[PDB]
Nucleic acid binder design. Structure first.
Ligand SMILES: [Mg+2]
Ligand SMILES: [Mg+2]
Ligand SMILES: [Mg+2]
Ligand SMILES: [Mg+2]
Ligand SMILES: [Mg+2]
Ligand SMILES: [Mg+2]
Ligand SMILES: [Mg+2]
Ligand SMILES: [Mg+2]
Ligand SMILES: [Mg+2]
Ligand SMILES: [Mg+2]
Ligand SMILES: [Mg+2]
Ligand SMILES: [Mg+2]
Ligand SMILES: [Mg+2]
Ligand SMILES: [Mg+2]
Ligand SMILES: [Mg+2]
Ligand SMILES: [Mg+2]
Ligand SMILES: [Mg+2]
Ligand SMILES: [Mg+2]
Ligand SMILES: [Mg+2]
Ligand SMILES: [Mg+2]
Ligand SMILES: [Mg+2]
Ligand SMILES: [Mg+2]
Ligand SMILES: [Mg+2]
Ligand SMILES: [Mg+2]
Ligand SMILES: [Mg+2]
Ligand SMILES: [Mg+2]
Ligand SMILES: [Mg+2]
Ligand SMILES: [Mg+2]
Ligand SMILES: [Mg+2]
Ligand SMILES: [Mg+2]
Ligand SMILES: [Mg+2]
Ligand SMILES: [Mg+2]
Ligand SMILES: [Mg+2]
Ligand SMILES: [Mg+2]
Ligand SMILES: [Mg+2]
Ligand SMILES: [Mg+2]
Ligand SMILES: [Mg+2]
Ligand SMILES: [Mg+2]
Ligand SMILES: [Mg+2]
Ligand SMILES: [Mg+2]
Ligand SMILES: [Mg+2]
Ligand SMILES: [Mg+2]
Ligand SMILES: [Mg+2]
Ligand SMILES: [Mg+2]
Ligand SMILES: [Mg+2]
Ligand SMILES: [Mg+2]
Ligand SMILES: [Mg+2]
Ligand SMILES: [Mg+2]
Ligand SMILES: [Mg+2]
Lengths: 93, 271, 46
RNA sequence: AGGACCGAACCGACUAAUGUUGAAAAAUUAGCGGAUGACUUGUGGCUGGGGGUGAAAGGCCAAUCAAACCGGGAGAUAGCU
RNA sequence: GCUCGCCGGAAGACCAAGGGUUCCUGUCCAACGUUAAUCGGGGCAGGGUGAGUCGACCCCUAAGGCGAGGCCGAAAGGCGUAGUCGAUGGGAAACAGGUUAAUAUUCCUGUACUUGGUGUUACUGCGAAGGGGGGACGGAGAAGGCUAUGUUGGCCGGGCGACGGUUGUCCCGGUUUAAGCGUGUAGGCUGGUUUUCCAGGCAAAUCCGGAAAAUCAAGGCUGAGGCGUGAUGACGAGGCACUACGGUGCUGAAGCAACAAAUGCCCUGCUUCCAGGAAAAGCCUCUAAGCAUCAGGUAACAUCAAAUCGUACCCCAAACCGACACAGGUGGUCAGGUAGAGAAUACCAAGGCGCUUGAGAGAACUCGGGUGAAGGAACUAGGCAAAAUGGUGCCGUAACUUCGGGAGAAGGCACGCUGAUAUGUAGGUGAGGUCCCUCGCGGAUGGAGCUGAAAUCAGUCGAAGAUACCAGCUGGCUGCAACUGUUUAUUAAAAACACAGCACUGUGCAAACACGAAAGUGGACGUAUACGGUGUGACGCCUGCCCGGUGCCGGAAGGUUAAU
């Protein structure tokens, strides 16, 4: 499970937005881009350590990257895991 | 019993129905059933190999004691059952020692009889035993053809063989079909005639009837085109052929049997 | 009115999919050509 | 009880007119046949080209079928235009 | 924004398949959009899909596929054993409310439930790839009890009428609440328990099967709904404050009864019939190799676990199949009010729409319709197309017939409303009260209330009361086909094909026959009361003569005759 190597490699980036924001207000939940191959567990683990806060539950989904065909030849944006991380109640960084 | 139906509707007015009250109602004795899946008449190459076979009713297979090996142990007729997979009815028998079995129901079998098998067994309707121990003249059904191999002859509703000679190590049966064939006397066989015999008074009385027995329709060759069937085309009702199989082979009388290998055993061809 | 193309992924991949081509001499050969002609999509996929 | 009767759904396709560079490479509208049965329909499987399948019209086998489609022999051959 | 109109068993709402960002917002208008377009399923950017218990993965198997070794085959390769895959079927668990511009049975609130790991504790024979149970199965019909739902009364909040009347027998609205837990009702099925013994269940068995006795009759298995709780809750008109006038916050009445009532549920039932109606695991039990102070097995509590992938949006279509923003096609679920048999049909409700060129004109002609004096098939290949018939109940109805039919033959009669019988009838329903009692969701008594056709008499309005939609024209003669079915997708639906029935003919099973160089396989888990080939085509009455020709069956003495 640690594989601290992993826990460092598993949190990619914060994710910003209305929802993401009101989600921090109303629900003490925080939203992250996390490796595609990461598990809700791995997501909880590393969040506990790296962000020293207590994680109550983790929801995920996979976002499908949109497509933008520019004349005949087309292109696609790649896919990423979005991670709803709730924070117990002891709420900090 | 054999019943006429009232003409409350054409296609029901010619129905003649064989209904039999001594037959169990409800599902058979589950332990003796297997699957049996329909085949459209097609083989493992997906090709139709026998014409006219499709659909109509679903059918569970009941394991039937063709061999009759439980010698020495009596058994009694629990009851009489219909069997969707053949014309003979069948007997649910309880053996003394607990084991159960189905058998071809013979002519008079009633609930609560005592059948039995083995080189001894009382010569009575229902009983199985080698033929070397069956009185020449007897009439016998479900006749083994190799010793042990189990019943093959006279298995169908209304039918029976008659032993008409011992001699040698073989007997000599009068087959239902008029034929007479030698058959080693150690081949087992059953006393009585096979049961249901008004079978052949049914009429169906309507096209469905046959469908719902898996039979699909028969198209006369004279109704096809040259391309299809050797019986050609027409042009206002014509034939002019020498009657044939779809495949350039002849009916109206050309003989087909060709075994040599089993010629020895046949003593008089049917007439 | 009912036209001849009625889609169904399940059937598609079974009839022409990559693996079915792989099953046999003359499907491995479809694939084979397609590779020689430099095809972009050998077969149709996810 | 019934391949029973009437009649929606559902399955069909008898008539007329409309359309015919259509709303549509076969339909719209008004009427019509079956509608508990040889009924109707979903999903997946099987049968392959002188082969299939066919309640038989040479019908159907992807807008096609008296021998499917694709590629190849291939620049078939054309005393014809 | 206010009208108007259209759909409403759909032109609404849901799923699934297919699509793959079309979803929401900002922004833009070239091109796409049959017009303009500030708008868009168009461009561009950004945001958006949250699950132990919805689905898939997973376990199980179907048809079918593949398939070690194997059988067969010039090579290719075809079969196929053990196995292994394959749902269109079986297999554990979640609900109501709230919230986002866009996700929700997934997030929040509230209240649950499933099966595992770990522990603790008390208690015990546990133990499979095996046995047995079970899972586990058709059609049709019947009628009782229910719920979903709706009607009315009551209850609560509000209302006193743009024009004569409306403080009342008046008007309008609302009157909603889940899983779970507890209870075991209507109703369905079956007698129970003990002991002994046995050729069966590939070994074993305490289980299943079978044989004996002994004993008590009440025992068990299933099971909708109701009631209780869940709910101190949620929702709930409307108020009360703020408001960028988009909304937000706060608070919150009544929340009952009777009656009607599915096609849903009890019902995988019951009854009944011939065509006689999947498999495998989960699951319960039984032992085998085994392990025996262990492990396990069972139960309470406690605790940890339930991953991964789908989840936006279109849904009978502008997003799917049709080259189109195409009058076409596309499986499944939900069923409100009035009238009605009805899921028809007309009009509404909720919800969704007016179909992406409009503006005028008011010629011929075309298309789609409405009415038409007199006449009434004279039209025409033909009554083609029109027009007409059209419901219910009673009366009544010919030839002929296989006695079922014909037949809805034909033809008559009634039909609205009001009152009376009876201030609402027969019927349905059924509360208080009374008595019982194995006292329960019980029985008997009882008839309040509620609902409520049909009928006769009388009176009454109109030209007309099955007033609209909706909804048979009838009859006589005669060809062919018995009949229901089938067929030329796209000019042929018929007298053609099939068909039950009949006949001939082959076939002794390793059948004939058929697919196959073959193995293997259909025929068939069938066996002459069967299976194939052929022709005839219900049924009634019948089916004559010819064997020279051709075919086929039999035959053999001669004659002729291959390889050799
Ligand atoms: Mg959660
Ligand atoms: Mg997920
Ligand atoms: Mg026939
Ligand atoms: Mg025939
Ligand atoms: Mg023909
Ligand atoms: Mg031929
Ligand atoms: Mg002629
Ligand atoms: Mg009928
Ligand atoms: Mg009808
Ligand atoms: Mg029509
Ligand atoms: Mg075609
Ligand atoms: Mg050719
Ligand atoms: Mg050449
Ligand atoms: Mg050329
Ligand atoms: Mg719609
Ligand atoms: Mg786009
Ligand atoms: Mg434009
Ligand atoms: Mg939009
Ligand atoms: Mg757009
Ligand atoms: Mg091999
Ligand atoms: Mg194989
Ligand atoms: Mg499997
Ligand atoms: Mg499935
Ligand atoms: Mg939405
Ligand atoms: Mg434990
Ligand atoms: Mg088992
Ligand atoms: Mg109710
Ligand atoms: Mg006034
Ligand atoms: Mg959705
Ligand atoms: Mg349009
Ligand atoms: Mg369309
Ligand atoms: Mg309608
Ligand atoms: Mg408009
Ligand atoms: Mg338009
Ligand atoms: Mg008129
Ligand atoms: Mg006139
Ligand atoms: Mg007149
Ligand atoms: Mg007249
Ligand atoms: Mg004239
Ligand atoms: Mg004339
Ligand atoms: Mg006409
Ligand atoms: Mg008309
Ligand atoms: Mg009256
Ligand atoms: Mg004539
Ligand atoms: Mg006919
Ligand atoms: Mg045609
Ligand atoms: Mg036609
Ligand atoms: Mg026959
Ligand atoms: Mg004929």
């Amino acid at each position: 499970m640690i594989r601290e190597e992993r826990l460092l490699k598993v949190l990619r980036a914060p994710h910003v937005s209305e929802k993401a924001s009101t989600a921090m207000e109303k629900s003490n939940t925080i939203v992250l881009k996390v490796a595609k191959d990461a598990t809700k567990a791995e997501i909880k683990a590393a969040v506990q350590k790296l962000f020293e806060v207590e994680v109550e539950v983790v929801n995920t989904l996979v976002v499908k990257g949109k497509v933008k065909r520019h004349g005949q030849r087309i292109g696609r944006r790649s896919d990423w895991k979005k991670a709803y991380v709730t924070l117990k109640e002891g709420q900090n960084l | 019993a054999v019943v006429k139906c009232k003409p409350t509707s054409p296609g029901r007015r010619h129905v003649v129905k064989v209904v039999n009250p001594e037959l169990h109602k409800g599902k058979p004795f589950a332990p003796l059933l297997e699957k049996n899946s329909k085949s459209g008449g097609r083989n493992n190459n997906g090709r139709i190999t026998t014409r006219h076979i499709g659909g109509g009713h679903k059918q569970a297979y009941r394991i039937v004691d063709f061999k009759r090996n439980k010698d020495g142990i009596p058994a009694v007729v629990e009851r009489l059952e219909y069997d969707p997979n053949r014309s003979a009815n069948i007997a649910l028998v309880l053996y003394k020692d607990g084991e159960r079995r189905y058998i071809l129901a013979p002519k008079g079998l009633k609930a609560g009889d005592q059948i039995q098998s083995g080189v001894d067994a009382a010569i009575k309707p229902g009983n199985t035993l080698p033929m070397r121990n069956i009185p020449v003249g007897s009439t016998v059904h479900n006749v083994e053809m190799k010793p042990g191999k189990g019943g093959q002859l006279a298995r169908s509703a209304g039918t029976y063989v008659q032993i008409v000679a011992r001699d040698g190590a073989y007997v000599t049966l009068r087959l239902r079909s008029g034929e007479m064939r030698k058959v080693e006397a150690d081949c087992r066989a059953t006393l009585g005639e096979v049961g249901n015999a008004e079978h052949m008074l049914r009429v169906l009385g309507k096209a469905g009837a046959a469908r719902w027995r898996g039979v699909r329709p028969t198209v006369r060759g004279t109704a096809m085109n040259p391309v299809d069937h050797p019986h050609g085309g027409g042009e206002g009702r014509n034939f002019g052929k020498h009657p044939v199989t779809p495949w350039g082979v002849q009916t109206k009388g050309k003989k087909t049997r060709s075994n040599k290998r089993t010629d020895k055993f046949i003593v008089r061809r049917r007439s | 009115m009912k036209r001849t193309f009625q889609p169904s992924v399940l059937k598609r991949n079974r009839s022409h999919g990559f693996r079915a081509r792989m099953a046999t001499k003359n499907g491995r050969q479809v694939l084979a050509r397609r590779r020689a002609k430099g095809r972009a999509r050998l077969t149709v996929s996810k």
